[PDB]
Amino acid sequence: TGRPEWIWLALGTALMGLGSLYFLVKGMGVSDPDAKKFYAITTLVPAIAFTMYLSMLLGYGLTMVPFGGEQNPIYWARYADWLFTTPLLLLDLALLVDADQGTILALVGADGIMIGTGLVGALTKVYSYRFVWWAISTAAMLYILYVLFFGFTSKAESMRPEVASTFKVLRNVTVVLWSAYPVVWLIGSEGAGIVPLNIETLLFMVLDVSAKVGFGLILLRSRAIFG
Ligand SMILES: *C/C=C(C)/C=C/C=C(C)/C=C/C1=C(C)CCCC1(C)C
Numbered sequence: 001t002g003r004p005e006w007i008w009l010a011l012g013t014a015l016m017g018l019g020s021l022y023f024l025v026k027g028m029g030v031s032d033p034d035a036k037k038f039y040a041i042t043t044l045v046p047a048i049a050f051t052m053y054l055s056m057l058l059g060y061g062l063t064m065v066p067f068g069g070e071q072n073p074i075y076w077a078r079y080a081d082w083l084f085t086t087p088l089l090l091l092d093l094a095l096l097v098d099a100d101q102g103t104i105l106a107l108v109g110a111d112g113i114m115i116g117t118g119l120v121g122a123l124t125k126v127y128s129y130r131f132v133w134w135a136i137s138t139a140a141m142l143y144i145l146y147v148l149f150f151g152f153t154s155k156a157e158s159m160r161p162e163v164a165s166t167f168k169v170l171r172n173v174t175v176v177l178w179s180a181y182p183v184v185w186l187i188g189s190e191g192a193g194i195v196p197l198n199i200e201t202l203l204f205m206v207l208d209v210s211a212k213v214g215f216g217l218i219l220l221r222s223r224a225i226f227g
Contacts, residue, residue, distance in 0.1 A: 001059055005201035009057040012205040016050035019213030026220060034227030041092050042216040045085045049212055052081035053205075067127045073197055074190060078204070079119040087111045089215060093148060093174065096167050096224060097156040107147055114140035122190040130190065138182045145175050159224075166224040170215060177211040 020043055027039030055061050061077020087108045094104045114137045121133030148171050156167040184207070185191055188200035195203070219225065 004196075004198035006057060008198065008201040008205045009053055012208060013050055013053040013057050015205075015209045015213060016046040016053055019209075019216060020046040020050055023216055023220060032226050035225045037095060038092060038225040039220060041088050041095075042220055045088050045092075046212045046216065048085050048088075049081050049208060052077050063123075065123055065125065067125050067130060068193065070193075072189060072193070074122050075201075076119060076122065079115050079122070081208075082118075083112070083115045085212065086115060089174070089211070090144065090148075092215075092219060093152060093167065093170060096163065096170070096219075097152045097159060099152060099155060103147070103151060107144055110140045110143045110147075113137070114144070118185070122185075131186075134182070134185060134191065141178060141182065145178060148174060162222075163224040166219070166222040169218055173215055173218065174211070177207050180207055 023039060023043035023046065027036070027043050030036060030039060052061065056075055056077045061080065062073060062075050064071040065074045066072070090107045090111055091104065093099075094107065099107075116137075117133045117140065118137040121130050121137060124130045124133055153168065153171060156164040159167070180203075184195070184200060184203050187194040188203075189195075189197045
């Protein structure tokens with residue numbers, strides 16, 4: 001098939017795989033129960049991403065959606081990855097600041113809406129309606145980020161500075177990275193079709209790897225994970 005974006009797909013597979021392994025290797029040596037909690041969640045995240053980059057590298061997770069007078073190439077495997085990796089990353093942040101169950105439930109629930117409406121949008125055939133779903137998915141994301149910035153940060157204040165300072169770094173990387181996804185979608189293949197798929201795949205790989213392995217490295221090399 002030889003598509004232009006495959007090299008970016010091979011590179012995402014490689015980074016996710018390696019990252020996952022190292023997390024698994026480091027996770028199975030630790031004995032602290034709480035540290036175990038965090039290690040298992042954080043290793044699972046790039047492990048799911050790896051299997052999906054792999055499938056996409058191999059020709060799966062792609063569909064031609066008609067709109068704008070074109071047969072548009074939409075990588076839906078992406079949302080199958082994010083459906084489970086985005087709430088797991090949220091879970092990691094919540095366990096860190098001892099968020100309440102209702103908060104977690106409501107954050108995981110807003111995240112299901114975001115990915116769900118996002119995919120519906122990336123699958124929608126009436127061009128302008130693609131942006132209506134996109135708009136709702138983004139409002140869901142702004143809800144989640146509001147909660148991470150205003151709620152959590154506040155709770156990380158009952159924690160010790162080492163823990164509060166690790167959370168603020170992960171919160172910052174998360175707000176910066178997640179903010180970028182909706183803009184990539186908008187000017188890329190699912191949206192305006194301004195940025196081509198190969199470049200678009202590159203941006204998504206950089207955001208995904210940063211948000212999973214980048215995030216994981218920061219979290220797991222910290223002392224805040226300990227019970
Ligand atoms: C490992 C993956 C991460 C941290 C993915 C984050 C993905 C997002 C924040 C995605 C957001 C989207 C929107 C706000 C609207 C349009 C569609 C999405 C799903 C790309």
